[PDB]
Design a protein around this ligand. Structure first.
Ligand SMILES: C[C@H](C(=O)Nc1cncc2ccccc12)c1ccc(Cl)c(Cl)c1
Ligand SMILES: C[C@H](C(=O)Nc1cncc2ccccc12)c1ccc(Cl)c(Cl)c1
Ligand SMILES: [Cl-]
Ligand SMILES: [Cl-]
Ligand SMILES: [Cl-]
Lengths: 301, 305
């Protein structure tokens, strides 16, 4: 019993964190095999932030301009290349702690663990979701660039995020491990704003199923709804539309608790209309949207 | 920016998790140097748990009754002994991944990271607080017994908790690493109930300081209060008393934000008597009490491990 926001154990990722210094900028790198991955903005100065030409800046760099430090050992950079917004520094030593890994690009609503680092040193691990507006609500300070987001698939680390920047609202933007940004963001100091965020409806439903599994039932009702009527209501509360894919994905939870998805959707509509009336669900006074259907099944079963 | 419930990096503890099997029971062990620590209830059957004589049950056991597995390697148990509610299995191999460590007993209100394990395999890490009623509101399934709670002090792991059982309300009970339970609990199948829980006041104040550091300041007011008047109000809402030690510990956050502790206490007092009025603090509609003052400073300044 119990329901917590739980991150994956970070050990496999800690053994990959290194410090990358270029000129006056110091950030984090991910050392996998003989390659260190990090945000390409590490090569940027004061003049090259508003409109940097990264290809031109990288051509002017030599391997000796990059200082890579793994613990107390300095790694020798023997090559450099760029893949989208990620810089790849080829090193002379393969990381002996390299776990079984994959690079995966995730979709909005998906969750992952974040290993927040400073100067190549892990300081904390927390749990995030990719927001529908493609930002993440992380907890990061200056120097956290290059910190990674990941999930663990048995004994395999799927790297899905690398932190690049903090937007003016305090939310965070970054890329997958192939350097492609999540969202309409660029690694330039140009005026950028996240779109209006919405609630991940499928995750709220998954979390309501977690609450039922844990013995919470006060919010249940005798109503059901059509998918379209549910979406018309949910949208008025800035909730993401619930697709047939989401209904199917909630199927196992629906079978386990005996409550149909559209039946649970009618409970959610009621909660949006009434609020919680001083009650909590799994110790929370707000509806939680950072647990996917897969997270709820893994944590409850 | 941002404020998350953040656990310590778990790597130093993952390298210590092993699987301990005795008869039909399989749970987790903590392998440090040449000793594996685990709950002594691993030696129990169904009848044994009801009314156990652990000294008598352990005397009947041999080293070969314990099956310890570290990854894919079976460790050889060369000794067994009991310290309070923890069983210590001496093994023939010292754990090469043993970090610098300490065994520490924590106080209620103190927070720690839990590495939830099943079959000696770490599956999740989460941050939680030792409640004033000595339970932890954890997330554990069958097989999680032996999972440990810890903090990281520079590069030294301080082990403070080992999971033993789940109470009928779904909350959790366990011991320090010397086998002494936190709270009035016993490792026997008998009727046990956690006392009425209270809110960790010093932690709520630390979290209000974290919200101010993040720019969320609607709850601040012009007022201050006495520690005496605040505690009278706190007792009424099932809040723990705030001591002069707590006021001193909140000092650096008070200096950083420009909000004296008794000034923040007057904000907390109004929040209790009037509610949030539809507003949230750090995206929460409830007052959060699982971040200590040290946790808020560590996160809002970026201390590494
Ligand atoms: C390096 C910096 C950045 O946003 N860093 C941070 C990352 N995360 C949190 C921070 C909190 C406070 C201050 C800086 C934080 C930055 C600035 C502009 C651009 Cl376009 C890019 Cl790619 C990167
Ligand atoms: C081994 C079991 C126990 O509490 N198990 C669990 C421990 N943690 C979570 C659980 C979730 C679901 C089911 C069982 C969970 C137990 C029973 C009674 C006593 Cl007195 C003791 Cl010491 C131990
Ligand atoms: Cl599923
Ligand atoms: Cl809440
Ligand atoms: Cl402090």
């Amino acid at each position: 019993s119990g329901f917590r926001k739980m991150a994956f154990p970070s050990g496999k990722v800690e053994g990959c964190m290194v410090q990358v210094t270029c000129g006056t900028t110091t950030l984090n790198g991910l050392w996998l095999d003989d390659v260190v991955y990090c945000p390409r903005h590490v090569i940027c100065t004061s003049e090259d932030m508003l409109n940097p030409n990264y290809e031109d800046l990288l051509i002017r760099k030599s391997n000796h301009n990059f200082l890579v430090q793994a613990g107390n050992v300095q790694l020798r950079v023997i090559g450099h290349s760029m893949q989208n917004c990620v810089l790849k520094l080829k090193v002379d030593t393969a990381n002996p702690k390299t776990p079984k890994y994959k690079f995966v690009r995730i979709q909005p609503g998906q969750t992952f663990s974040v290993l927040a680092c400073y100067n190549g040193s892990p300081s904390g691990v927390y749990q995030c979701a990719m927001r529908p507006n493609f930002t993440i609500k992380g907890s990061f300070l200056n120097g956290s660039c290059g910190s990674v987001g990941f999930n663990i698939d048995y004994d395999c680390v799927s790297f899905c995020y690398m932190h690049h920047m903090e937007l003016p609202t305090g939310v965070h933007a970054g890329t997958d491990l192939e350097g492609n940004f999540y969202g309409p963001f660029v690694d330039r100091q140009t005026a950028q704003a996240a779109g209006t965020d919405t609630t991940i409806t499928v995750n709220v439903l998954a979390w309501l199923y977690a609450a039922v599994i844990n013995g919470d039932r006060w919010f249940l009702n005798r109503f059901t709804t059509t998918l379209n009527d549910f979406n018309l209501v949910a949208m008025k509360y800035n909730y993401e539309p619930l697709t047939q894919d989401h209904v199917d994905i909630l199927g196992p939870l629906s079978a386990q608790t005996g409550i149909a998805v559209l039946d649970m959707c009618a409970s959610l509509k009621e909660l949006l209309q009434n609020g919680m009336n001083g009650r909590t669900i799994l110790g929370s006074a707000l509806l939680e949207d950072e647990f996917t259907p897969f997270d709820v099944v893994r944590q409850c079963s």
